C-alpha cells in the first residue's frame, strides 16, 4: 500500500477531494485564528498599556488585528489605552467569533465536497476523465487576487471605506489606526512609510488585475507548457511553495528589522534599536532640550514619559530570550510597575560616570563605569586583592532624577553596585515578579518568535520546493530508471549527452 | 525447539457504531470526572 | 483557581488512552 508519507497523494487526481482537503485546511487555519484570539483575550491584561502592553504579554495574534484597525474590545477597553469606545461588532471578540463561524462553514463545505467529489465540472468533456485547466485557473485566481489587493489598498487602507492601518510616531508613543494616503514618489519605497504600503497595494492590485486578464485570455506557449509541465498540478505546488518561502523570508526580515507594517507598539522594539541606543539618544535629546530651556535635572528628567524609558531597557530587546524560555516576557523580569528614574553616577572626585550597557550578545557582562573621555574610572572587581577601581575605593555615589527615586542619592556601596547593575540593562524599572512567578531570565518578544518561526519555515519550504520541483520534472523516473539505459549514458558515444540522434 | 504457528488466534473487531458508542462514553466520563480530577 | 496540579494530565490521559484503544481497534477491523 501507500507508505505513510504518501497518504495524501490520494487526492492528487481528484479535484473534488483536493478542494475538500483545501477547505478542511482553511477551516483549521481559520479556527486556529479564532481560538487563538479567544485565548489571548481570555488572558490579556488591558489595564496598563504603558508598562504592560500586548507585546509584553506574549500576545501573538492581537497585534495583527490591531495593525489593520481592530483595536477595541466589547469589554470596554482598547489597545490604544482608551476606555469606553464602541467598536461595534468588529471588536477582537467579534473578529474571533467571525473566524470560528467561518471555520465551521468551511468544515461543512469540505464535508460536502468530500462526499460529492465526482462533479462533471472536474471531468474533461473532450475525453471523459478529471482534468483541471491550470493556466486558466491561474488567470482566474490572479484576477481575483488583484481585485482584492486593489480593494484592500484603495478602500481599507485609505479609509475611503475602511479603518486604515496602525501608524505611529518614530518612538512608538502615539500609535493609532488612521487612514493613510498612498505615497507615489520614491518615498513609497521607504519601508518605514505606510503610504508606501497603501500605494503598493493599489498599484500591485492593478498590475494583478491586468496580469490576470492576460492569463485569462492568452494560452501558454507550447515551449513553456512542456518545459514547466503545465498539465501537472505538482508544478503548481512547486512554484507556489517557492513563492511562499520567498514571502516568508520577506516577512521574517521585515519583522526583525522593523518597518511600517511591524510597529513597535504592537510587536515590541527591535534588537537594532537597543544596539544603537535609538531610544537612549531620543531620551537624552529631550532631556537636553529641557535643560536648554532652564529646567533642572529633576524637572528635565521628569518630563520623560515612562513608555519611552521602557523602550530603553534591554529586557525588551527581542534578542535576549531563549528557545526554551517560553511564554510572555512578563514571565521573565516580571510585570513592569514603574520607572525608577534616571541614575547619574558620580565618583568621589566629581567625575560623572557612564555604566557600559550590556550588548545583545552577552548573557553576562562586567560592570564598567567610564568618564566623559572614555576612560574607566570604576568597576566591580572579580578579584579584590589587587582591585583599584572598585566602587568602594572610588567612592561612587548615584543620584536619581525623575521616576520613583527622583531626588534620591545613594552612597552605600551595596546600593550603588546594585544600581550600576541595573543601569547595565538600560532604564531601571520596578517589577512585580509574584503574579507570574517570574524566574529572572529574559524572554523574547512576539517580534522574535514570529521571526524565528517564519525563518525556520521558509528554510524548510526551500526543501519542499526542491522536492516537489524534482518530482514534477522527474515524474517519469519516480519509480526507477528504465531497465535499459545502457549506451545513452556511456561516455563519448553521443555528441550531445542523452541525445541518441547525435552519433 | 521449533516455532509453530498458533491456530488459536482470532481477529478482533469493533464496528463503527461501537466506535461511536465507546467514544461518547469516554468523552462523557471525561466530562464527569475532570472536575473532580481538578478538585 | 488553585486546582489539583495533576488535573490536566489525568483528564487528558483518562480520555486519550481509551480513545486510542477504540481508534486502533476500529481502524484495524477487517484485517
Amino acid at each position: 500500500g501507500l507508505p505513510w508519507y504518501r497518504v495524501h497523494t490520494v487526492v492528487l487526481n481528484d479535484p473534488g477531494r483536493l478542494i475538500s482537503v483545501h477547505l478542511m485546511h482553511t477551516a483549521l487555519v481559520a479556527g486556529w485564528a479564532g481560538s487563538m484570539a479567544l485565548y489571548e483575550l481570555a488572558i490579556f491584561d488591558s489595564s496598563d498599556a504603558v508598562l504592560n502592553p500586548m507585546w509584553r504579554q506574549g500576545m501573538f495574534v492581537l497585534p495583527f488585528m490591531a495593525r489593520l484597525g481592530v483595536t477595541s474590545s466589547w469589554n470596554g477597553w482598547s489597545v490604544t489605552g482608551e476606555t469606553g469606545l464602541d467598536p461595534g461588532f468588529w471588536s477582537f471578540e467579534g473578529v474571533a467569533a467571525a473566524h470560528i463561524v467561518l471555520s465551521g462553514l468551511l468544515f461543512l463545505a469540505a464535508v460536502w465536497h468530500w462526499v460529492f467529489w465526482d462533479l462533471e465540472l472536474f471531468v474533461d468533456p473532450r475525453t471523459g476523465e478529471s482534468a483541471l485547466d491550470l493556466p486558466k485557473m491561474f488567470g482566474i485566481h490572479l484576477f481575483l487576487s488583484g481585485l482584492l489587493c486593489f480593494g484592500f489598498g484603495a478602500f481599507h487602507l485609505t479609509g475611503v471605506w475602511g479603518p486604515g492601518m496602525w501608524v505611529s510616531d518614530p518612538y512608538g508613543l502615539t500609535g493609532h489606526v488612521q487612514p493613510v494616503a498612498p505615497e507615489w514618489g520614491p518615498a513609497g519605497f521607504n519601508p518605514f512609510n505606510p503610504g508606501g504600503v497603501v500605494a503598493h497595494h493599489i498599484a500591485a492590485g492593478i498590475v494583478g488585475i491586468i496580469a490576470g486578464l492576460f492569463h485569462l485570455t492568452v494560452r501558454p506557449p507550447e515551449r513553456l507548457y512542456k518545459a514547466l509541465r503545465m498539465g501537472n498540478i505538482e508544478t503548481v505546488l512547486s512554484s507556489s511553495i517557492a513563492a511562499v518561502f520567498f514571502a516568508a523570508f520577506v516577512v521574517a526580515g521585515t519583522m526583525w528589522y522593523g518597518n511600517a507594517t511591524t510597529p513597535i507598539e504592537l510587536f515590541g522594539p527591535t534588537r537594532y534599536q537597543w544596539d544603537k541606543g535609538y531610544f537612549q539618544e531620543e531620551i537624552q535629546r529631550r532631556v537636553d532640550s529641557q535643560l536648554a530651556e532652564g529646567a533642572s535635572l529633576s524637572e528635565a528628567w521628569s518630563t520623560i514619559p515612562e513608555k519611552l524609558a521602557f523602550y530603553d531597557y534591554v529586557g525588551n530587546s527581542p534578542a535576549k530570550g531563549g528557545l526554551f524560555r517560553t511564554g510572555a516576557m512578563n514571565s521573565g523580569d516580571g510585570i513592569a510597575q514603574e520607572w525608577i528614574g534616571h541614575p547619574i553616577f558620580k565618583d568621589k572626585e566629581g567625575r560623572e560616570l557612564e555604566v557600559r550597557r550590556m550588548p545583545n550578545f552577552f548573557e553576562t557582562f562586567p560592570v564598567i563605569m567610564t568618564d566623559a573621555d572614555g576612560v574607566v574610572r570604576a568597576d566591580i572587581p572579580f578579584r579584590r586583592s589587587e582591585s583599584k577601581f572598585s566602587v568602594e575605593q572610588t567612592g561612587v555615589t548615584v543620584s536619581f532624577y525623575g521616576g520613583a527615586l527622583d531626588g534620591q542619592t545613594f552612597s552605600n556601596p551595596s546600593d550603588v553596585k546594585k544600581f550600576a547593575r541595573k543601569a547595565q540593562l538600560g532604564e531601571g524599572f520596578d517589577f512585580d515578579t509574584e503574579t507570574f512567578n517570574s524566574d529572572g531570565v529574559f524572554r523574547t518578544s512576539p517580534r522574535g518568535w514570529f521571526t524565528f518561526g517564519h525563518a525556520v519555515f521558509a528554510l524548510l519550504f526551500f526543501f519542499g520546493h526542491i522536492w516537489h520541483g524534482s518530482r514534477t520534472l522527474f515524474r517519469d523516473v519516480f519509480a526507477g530508471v528504465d531497465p535499459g539505459l545502457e549506451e545513452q549514458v556511456e561516455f563519448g558515444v553521443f555528441a550531445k549527452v542523452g541525445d541518441l540522434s547525435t552519433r | 525447539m521449533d516455532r509453530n504457528s498458533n491456530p488459536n488466534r482470532q481477529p478482533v473487531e469493533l464496528n463503527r457504531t461501537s466506535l461511536y458508542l465507546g467514544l461518547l462514553l469516554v468523552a462523557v466520563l471525561g466530562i464527569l470526572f475532570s472536575s473532580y480530577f481538578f478538585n | 483557581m488553585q486546582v489539583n496540579n495533576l488535573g490536566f494530565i489525568a483528564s487528558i490521559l483518562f480520555v486519550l488512552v481509551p480513545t486510542v484503544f477504540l481508534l486502533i481497534l476500529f481502524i484495524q477491523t477487517g484485517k
Binding site: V111 | N15, Y20, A27, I31, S34 | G7, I12
Partner: peptide, 30 residues
C-alpha cells in the same frame, strides 16, 4: 486553565455526536 480542559471534553462529545449522526453506518435491509 482547567477551563480549557472542560471545553475540550465538551467539544469532543459534541463532535462525536455530529459524526455519529452525519457519518453513521447506514442501516441496510438484506
Amino acid at each position: 486553565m482547567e477551563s480549557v480542559a472542560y471545553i475540550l471534553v465538551l467539544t469532543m462529545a459534541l463532535a462525536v455526536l455530529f459524526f455519529a449522526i452525519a457519518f453513521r453506518e447506514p442501516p441496510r435491509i438484506e
